[PDB]
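Hey all, sorry for the wall of text incoming. These are the two entities for the joint prediction.
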Amino acid sequence: ARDDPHFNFRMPMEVREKLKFRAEANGRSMNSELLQIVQDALSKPSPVTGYRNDAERLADEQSELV
Amino acid sequence: ARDDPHFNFRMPMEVREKLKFRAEANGRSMNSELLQIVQDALSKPSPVTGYRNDAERLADEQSELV
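and here's what came out:
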């Protein structure tokens, strides 16, 4: 669609229990929690801000593991 | 049998350009990359080495319930 695209995620049993618990366990609803952890995971700050860190690791261990 | 379940994820243009430019931009193919960061995202650390954290960053998990 090229402005808000759909794709199938679509995940092995423990990732979609871990990502959907992280949602239903904690308080986001995975198109919510997947987005707020994913916009978290590779775009980082909601403004507190005592936040500089290895989320520079899901960086260099997804992408120097790869 | 369901040991890999669907949803349609579904992302505003910035998250699917930043999840997919990561991916490369597109060689390791976001069902592939989204999984291999997401498996990185809710299931690292490695004790530094590299690395500890999303600390701080899944404290931005607290933020998005905060």
